[PDB]
Amino acid sequence: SGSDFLWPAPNEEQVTCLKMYFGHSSFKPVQWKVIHSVLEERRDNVAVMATGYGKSLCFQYPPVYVGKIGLVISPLISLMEDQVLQLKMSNIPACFLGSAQSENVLTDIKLGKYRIVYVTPEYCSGNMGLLQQLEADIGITLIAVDEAHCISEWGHDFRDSFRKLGSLKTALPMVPIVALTATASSSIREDIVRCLNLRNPQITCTGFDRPNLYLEVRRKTGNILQDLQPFLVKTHWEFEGPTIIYCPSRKMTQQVTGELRKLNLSCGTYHAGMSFSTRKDIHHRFVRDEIQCVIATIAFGMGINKADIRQVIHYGAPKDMESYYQEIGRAGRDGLQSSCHVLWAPADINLNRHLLTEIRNEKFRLYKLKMMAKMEKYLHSSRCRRQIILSHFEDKQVQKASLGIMGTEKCCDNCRSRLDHC
């Protein structure tokens, strides 16, 4: 909560604002990433949130914190009016601006008395000069475009009223745009970036429970082949399916690869010491199944994009929950059943607090120590693995919306253990 597991850390005024105006004790990680990128980098965002829950804070918090104006563009009239009501209940001045609004409300908006102004895309397109005046006189913290996938002619819910939003960025090039959508289509996402003319946006995709990922944590034996043989099938050996093994160091990547090659397994390594071309080559041979297993040290699994990854193994404790989340999310993109196993020991590199002693920035040292503790608590836990992840990353509505995976044999090792004999 507060500033605990977030870097850069929210400052005390930011936490106070969150408590006082939104009634929350913590930012979720994606919410902080959006908010911070807006406040400090003035950066465009595309935020895909699978359920739609949790997006409001991303565009409401920044203008409230800095005391300026946020514009929210949406076609969902009744929901916008609802949100205006809720804001005013929290002492946040907000209004829904349209043609029928009085010149006194318009003057109040020009005077900066409203933190959050909701408009339809049609009104917005008809009143660009007003928006520019608000930017010149007060400063627009961000423009939020909800239902942003509606700008795409390739999607099923295109609205003509969204086309003209392409001019926001040319009329207001310094104002960040936060485009929000629930649609998990990569091409719709690219279309949003293109049609809104966003500039190097931060792109985030969150809000999933990933029902086809089975989660398990096992202790290491200390013998690499003894540890990995359960993931192999014999008669010669091979992996059960395409596999990524994440290792915390290049030395361990080389050790693991050497051991697996003793069994003539088709492997490739993948780390930052390689040329961009060499890593592309390994990625391509993995995609076409010339290699069955990639052993990698690259953070987040960046660049390992393959539809049918059936197994992810973390060989050693992961670095922290954010890297773990990104790295196992690489699995099972085709929707078929996959498994994500961590093999760990308390002596693992990513749990060695002595490696943090020399950090000079006190706030960063605390962040790294908190992230180690949180990772270790996950690995040692008896609780549902998926519930731990969703509680850390998602707000409570997302967790409650999850249906049909948690508590079943397909969810995780701890859920399985609570169904079997205990």
Give min distance, CB of 359 to ligand A1CA5, in A: 21
Choice between 169 and 385, CB closer to ligand A1CA5: 385
Let me know how long the chain is: 422
Residues 6 or more apart whose Cβ sits within 8 Å of residue 219: 343, 344, 345
- Alpha-carbon dihedral sign for residues 342, 398, 114, 151: positive
Q: What tokens does 397 get?
A: 């509505």
210 binds, options ligand A1CA5, Zn ion, none, Cβ within 5 to 8 A by partner type: ligand A1CA5
Choice between 312 and 411, CB closer to Zn ion: 411
Choice between 84 and 296, CB closer to ligand A1CA5: 296
Choice between 15 and 415, CB closer to Zn ion: 415
On whether 363 is known to bind a ligand per the annotation, the reply is no
User: How far apart are the C-alpha atoms of 183 and 202, rounded to whole Å?
Assistant: 17
Choice between 135 and 327, CB closer to ligand A1CA5: 327
Distances, alpha carbon 139 to alpha carbons 33, 60, 66, 211, 420, in Å: 21, 15, 10, 43, 60
Choice between 64 and 411, CB closer to Zn ion: 411
141 binds, options ligand A1CA5, Zn ion, none, Cβ within 5 to 8 A by partner type: none
329 binds, options Zn ion, ligand A1CA5, none, Cβ within 5 to 8 A by partner type: ligand A1CA5
**Pair 140, 178: CB distance under 8 Å:** no
Q: Which residues bind ligand A1CA5 (CB under 6 A)?
A: 29-30, 33, 48, 184-186, 203-206, 208-210, 213, 322, 325-326, 328-330, 333, 386, 389
Give the residue at shortest CB distance from ligand A1CA5: 329
On whether 28 is known to bind a ligand per the annotation, the reply is yes
User: How far apart are the C-alpha atoms of 106 and 281, rounded to whole Å?
Assistant: 58
209 binds, options ligand A1CA5, Zn ion, none, Cβ within 5 to 8 A by partner type: ligand A1CA5
- Which CB contacts under 8 angstroms, 24+ apart, belong to 265-269? 265/232, 265/237, 265/238, 265/239, 265/292, 265/293, 266/238, 266/290, 266/291, 266/292, 266/293, 267/291, 267/292, 267/293, 267/294, 267/295, 268/293, 268/294, 268/295, 269/294, 269/295, 269/296
Residues 6 or more apart whose Cβ sits within 8 Å of residue 98: 119, 120, 123
Question: Which residues in the 361-420 window bind Zn ion by CB under 5 A?
Answer: 384, 386, 411-412, 415
263 binds, options Zn ion, ligand A1CA5, none, Cβ within 5 to 8 A by partner type: none
User: How far apart are the C-alpha atoms of 237 and 367, rounded to whole Å?
Assistant: 42
Give min distance, CB of 337 to ligand A1CA5, in A: 14
Give min distance, CB of 52 to Zn ion, in A: 24
On whether 205 is known to bind a ligand per the annotation, the reply is no
**Pair 408, 337: CB distance under 8 Å:** no
How far is CA 102 from its chain centroid? 40
On whether 384 is known to bind a ligand per the annotation, the reply is yes
On whether 14 is known to bind a ligand per the annotation, the reply is no
On whether 412 is known to bind a ligand per the annotation, the reply is yes
Show binding-site residues for Zn(2+).
384, 411-412, 415
Binding region for ATP: 24, 26, 28, 31, 52
Site of interaction with Zn ion (CB under 5 A)? 384, 386, 411-412, 415
